[PDB]
Structure formats: structure tokens, C-alpha cells
Copies of this chain bind each other. A is one copy, B any other.
């Protein structure tokens, strides 16, 4: 006929006596894709587990179903009618004596019980998990003194009917299994109930039962279910490694089974990085996919979910801004400071969030840019060249290069930048955070020596070290608290997401308590003014501030433009690639050509006002994306979490940028933060961003004996001595890059990264196997 299959919610009800000896059915276990048992002593629900059967119970079940009486497509609609029909058929099939007809019927008309039978508070919580269109089944297994032989009955109702006071949740029933036998047999009826329920909770078996017509089809379905099972021999499980191989073996077995099924069935039977050719094609394609959703981009942020992010993202886009800028003040003779960096961050962020194609990106100063800033400053103050005027021409060339790269569709080279260079560029970012911290500490200890009885203050070095260590430890332990197993589980996440503000506030109050001790503090000027209003204006003359600019450097400034373009391009395209994956349920569209052009043009224009260039960070962009995802609730117990949807809007980023811009009118309060707390946070970010990259783990695996290596796909398919050779080559390249960065040619490491782009292909294909590269240099997993 039609018999459209539905998902099944299976319940086990067992007959038992009460304290007043009145017999009644009590619920014992429930199946929603996984078994859940009721503990007898404490009367609560245990954790979900895989439903492991036993073989003797399966044999007994097959024998019982072979000798039982089955009713198919019954026309009854009430419990008494179903019970009467069942007892009549049991009488017909010579299973129960007619004299007991009056007795056994009374056993099928008893009240049902449940652990929770206040009720709605858990009834709704269980109804959320169950799929919307699910049809339930009831298994009634128990022993009766007045019977002599076991009797079984399988009933499939013609139409779903809601039997009240039978199940645990209001779901219609479709199937009924009744078993009633004597108590002197060797069979365990709880085991038979568990076996039949685990059979019915399966996918293929329950579909077959939906489409079945007699007992032979039930036997065939039982054989089909048994074909793809795993038998575990009777041996003690001593260690823990013994049961880590079941998943892979089950995967292979079910793969073979599904391949056989697919063969039998066969016998029975918009890339965003593709270049078209039209000039500026990518720009038009990206605009005409994202702009029409403009109204929805604003209407979609009216919920508290989109208000709790702005509170702490503001604290993540601000801490580096006041840190990095300070460093520039120490490195460029206070030509570029915290005020200019904050103004540039705000001004570029608001425009990008109003006109960008991917509003979920937050842009700001990053690690590998201040190194280039310092290198260019060192080069400028060697040949008697003004530092701040050359940046104007660098930006002028950068704006032209961006247009050249966008006009001819060329933002597809990010496909050639594989994991080999991404993991090196992650170590560079995570090592210009630790080095600056451990250099500032040494400088502090040198300026204020530790002799006995401004410069030479008594208790300044050790106090700064203590503040740094305290801030780092607080920020680390709150991060570890975020993913722990304490507290109600939603306050846990909220507290764990405020690690940085809490750490900074605590370690600022501690230093505010201490009096009569000098600790260096932030330098934020009053009002809207340039950090050095004695040698620098707001607009830079493109011809020369103090002396006329040379004409040769006007054209010879092509090389630094190319290097900084390489840096910006890598840092932005990698982030856009990471954000717009398929695992993250990002609807609408992503912009690969409207982000590069906008960022580089804004940087080039902004460098005229003596403000730094910016590039989208790849760590706080992921944090911004994560803070906006909402997970589903219709997930079966014990199943892995599933992302429902990500709220895409351009209102949280705009508000965060505006807040960071307005954070300059509270300078009187921002001048009370000591300069060691910020470096504690600096070191914390540097250390904590290492987790995730495979280069770090393969570097760990150097010190581990080959017996203790994990079972990941890049360690169990390649020999140990080739994994170590790959790691050694990567380390050698990283060390060479650091050496060339630390010498007098510091403004050449972008060229070294571009030269490690094709080393991979040419050399590491001429050496390694075509099969080992897919294991070690894989882009997925």
C-alpha cells in the first residue's frame, strides 16, 4: 500500500508488584537512537549508551516470534478493543487456555507508571528531543503466575492513535508487542524486551516492519539486521585501548554492507573563485549576491544573542589596540601611537561594516605588520629619509596594485597557499607575542636594577613581573573553566567568555590598592589630538615636511608596496577562506573580491593621514563568528551537537567599531591601567593561539616514543622517520625565516614566505611520495 515510514520512539514497560502488592506496569528504558535505562535503587535516568545485546536472548526472541501470533493492520482504536482482539487471537492460536481468558485480560487493562508520574516541566524537555513526525511503539513484557507457557503477540495498528496514560510523552502509538509467560522458565524476560526494542529502534528493521506483511518478512529482516553486527568474544576488558578499534571496524563493515546494497540498487535500476574573463567580474558577482539582502542584514539583529557579543568583542578589539600602538610609540619615536591606531581602527571598521561583503570580519593591527613597520623605520633613518612621508607613496602604490589585482581576476591564488605555509605564518604570529613580552620584561629589569639603598626605583621590576604573571594565570584559568564540567552550564559559558575583562579588572584593582610605588602606565592623550603635537600634523605633505623629498624614492618605493601587499593579502584571504567553510552554516554569501579591494584601498587612503594599515585578524574573526551561532534543540540524547544557524548582520560590528572609536573620551580612566597587565594579556594570547595547528603537534611528537603516538590519520599511514623529516624541514624553513627577519635585511621576510610557496610543490614533491603528501599536507580534517 503506502505505509510511509516514520521515526520511532520505543519504550519498555515491565509488569511488577507494588508495595500494596497491586500489579502494574512500570517503565524501564527508552530508545531515541540510543538506550536510556532507569536505575532501580535511585529511580533516575542513566547516561545514554550503545544498546549491547546478548546472543542467547536473540535466539530466544527468534524462537518466540516464530511460534507467536501476529495481528497486521488492526482496525481497533481503543485499548480495550485491542486487548480483546489480542486475547481472542491468542485463544485462536492455541497459546492460552480459554479458561484463563478472563484472567490474562485483566493483566492488559492495568494502570501504567513512569518515573516522573512538575510533569510538564520534563515532558516538554523530552518532547523537544523527539523528532516532530515520530510514531511510538510500546513493548509489554512480564511474567504471570497463572500461565504455563509463553505467549506472544505483535500488533500493527492501521492508523496512528493516541493512547492516553500508556507512554511517557503524548506521541501516537503504531506498534504493540505483548509477551506473557510463566515464571519458572530459564528465560529472562527483561532481556527479551531489550532485544525486541533494540530491533524495533533500528532504521532498516523498522522500515521493513512498516512494509512487512507476514512472519517470514520479519525473519528476513532479523537476518538482515544480524548480517551487519559485531560480535565481541568473552574476554575481560582490562585496559582502555581495547575498545578504541570498534568504531573503525564498524565503519568498514557498514561500508561494505552499504556498497552491496548500492550495487543491488544499481542492478535493479557556484564557485566563488572562478575567473570568467570579463574585467571586474568577481566584484559584480560578489555585489549582486550580497547587496540585495541589505534590509535583512539590519532586521536580523533584534535579540539578546546579538547584544551579549558586543559586550565582550569590544574587549577583544580594544586590548591589542592599546597594546600594539604603545609599542609603535616606543619604536617610531612616538610618531604613531595609541590614539592614531584607535582612530584608524574605528574609521576603517565602520566603513567596512557598512560597505563590506562579509560583515562578520573584524579588522585591526596584527603581529607581522609592526615588524615591517619597524624594519621600514630602520631603513628610513639610515639614508637621511623622512619616515612618515614615504608611507604616503607606499599607500599610493598599494592602491594601484589592489586595482590591478582585482581588475584581472587574480584572487584565486589563495588556493595555492596550502597548509604548509599557513602553519608557518601561524607560528610567526604566535612568536611576535612571546618575544615582545619577554623583551619588555628584560628592559624593565635593566632600567630599574635590583640594588639596595625616573630610574632606579626600588620595587618596580618585581611588581611588574608579579602583575604580568597574575594576569596571565587568571586569563588562562578562566579559559580552562569555560570548557570544564562545573556550574549550570550556561553561566559557565558566560563566565568563561569574560576572561580578559575579569583578569584586567582584578589585576588593575590590585595595583590601585598599592600606594607609594611607581609602575609605568598608559599614555593616552586628552581629547582628539595627535600623540605628538609638536612635530607632526594631521595631514602629511606628499612633497616633504622638513626637506624636499627625493624624486628617486618616489618611483623606487615599489618594493615595500609589494611586500606589504603580500602580507595584507595573505592575512585577509586566509581568514576569508577559514570563515566561509561548509561546517559553519553561513548562508547568504562571502566576498573574496569586495574585501581585498576595500581593505587595501582604505589602507592606502588612510596612510595619507599618518595612520597605519590594517588587515583582518583570523582569530577574533572566528570568535565573532562563534559568538553569533545558535545551536539546535531537536538533538537526540547522547548525540553530537549540531549548529542550527548563524545570525548574519552588520549591526554588531558597526557598534563595536563605534565603541572602540568613542573609547578615547575616557582617557582619564584608561590612564590608570599599568603597562604590565596588557603584556600579560599579550603573552596569554600568544601562548593560547598555538593550539590547533598541526605543526605544533608534530613538533610535540618528536619527544614521544613511537609507542605513545596518537591514532590520527597523519601518524598511522606514514613511517615515523618520514614524519620527523617533514617536521625537520618545516623547522629549518622557520629558523631561516627568523634569522633573515632578525638581521639588517628585516624587510624581506614576505619574499621568504612567497619563496616557501613553491618550495613545497617542487622540492617536497620531488622527495616525498604522492601518497604521503596527501596524509601530511591535507587541507581538510
Q: Are A48 and B466 in contact (CB under 8 A)?
A: no
Q: Are A487 and B703 in contact (CB under 8 A)?
A: yes
* Interface flags, A448-491, vs B, CB<8A=1, else 0: 00111100011100110110010000000000000001111100
Q: Are A246 and B243 in contact (CB under 8 A)?
A: yes
Query: Separation in Å of the A629 CB from the closest CB of chain B?
Result: 20
Task: Find residues 676-735 in chain A having any chain B CB closer than 8 Å to their own CB.
Answer: 703-705, 708, 711, 716-719
Q: Which residues of chain B are near A412, meaning CB under 8 Å?
A: none
Contact sample, A vs B, 24 pairs, CB 8 Å cutoff: A34-B235, A39-B716, A41-B717, A41-B771, A42-B717, A42-B718, A46-B716, A48-B239, A49-B242, A49-B243, A49-B244, A50-B232, A50-B245, A52-B245, A54-B253, A236-B254, A239-B639, A243-B246, A452-B458, A453-B453, A458-B458, A462-B462, A462-B463, A465-B466
Q: Are B34 and A242 in contact (CB under 8 A)?
A: yes
Q: Are B231 and A231 in contact (CB under 8 A)?
A: yes
Q: Which residues of chain B are near A516, meaning CB under 8 Å?
A: 450-452
Contacts A239-B638, A241-B47, A246-B52; A232 near B233 (Cβ below 8 A): no
With both beta carbons as reference points, the residue of chain B lying nearest to A640 in the complex is identified as B238
Chain A interface size band reads 35 or more
Q: Which residues of chain B are near A246, meaning CB under 8 Å?
A: 50, 52, 232, 237, 243
Chain A interface mostly:
loop
Cα-based distance from A457 to B459 in the complex (angstroms): 10
Query: Separation in Å of the A234 CB from the closest CB of chain B?
Result: 4
Copies of this protein in the assembly total: 2
Query: Separation in Å of the A125 CB from the closest CB of chain B?
Result: 12
Task: Find residues 4-47 in chain A having any chain B CB closer than 8 Å to their own CB.
Answer: 33-34, 39, 41-42, 44, 46-47
Q: Which residues of chain B are near A517, meaning CB under 8 Å?
A: 450, 452
Say if the beta carbon of A55 comes within 8 Å of chain B. Answer: yes
Q: Are A234 and B56 in contact (CB under 8 A)?
A: no
Cα-based distance from A439 to B640 in the complex (angstroms): 48
* Interface flags, A528-572, vs B, CB<8A=1, else 0: 000000000000000000000000000000000000000000000
Q: Show the binding face of A for B, using Cβ within 8 Å.
A: 33-34, 39, 41-42, 44, 46-56, 58, 198, 202, 225-239, 241-247, 249-250, 253-254, 257, 450-453, 457-459, 462-463, 465-466, 469, 485-489, 514, 516-518, 638-640, 703-705, 708, 711, 716-719, 771
- Of listed A51, A232, A244, A453, residue having the most chain B CB within 10 A: A232
Q: Are A54 and B230 in contact (CB under 8 A)?
A: yes
Cα-based distance from A395 to B47 in the complex (angstroms): 58
Q: Which residues of chain B are near A239, meaning CB under 8 Å?
A: 48, 638-640
Q: Are B229 and A55 in contact (CB under 8 A)?
A: yes
Q: Which residues of chain B are near A465, meaning CB under 8 Å?
A: 466
- Of listed A33, A229, A254, A466, residue having the most chain B CB within 10 A: A229
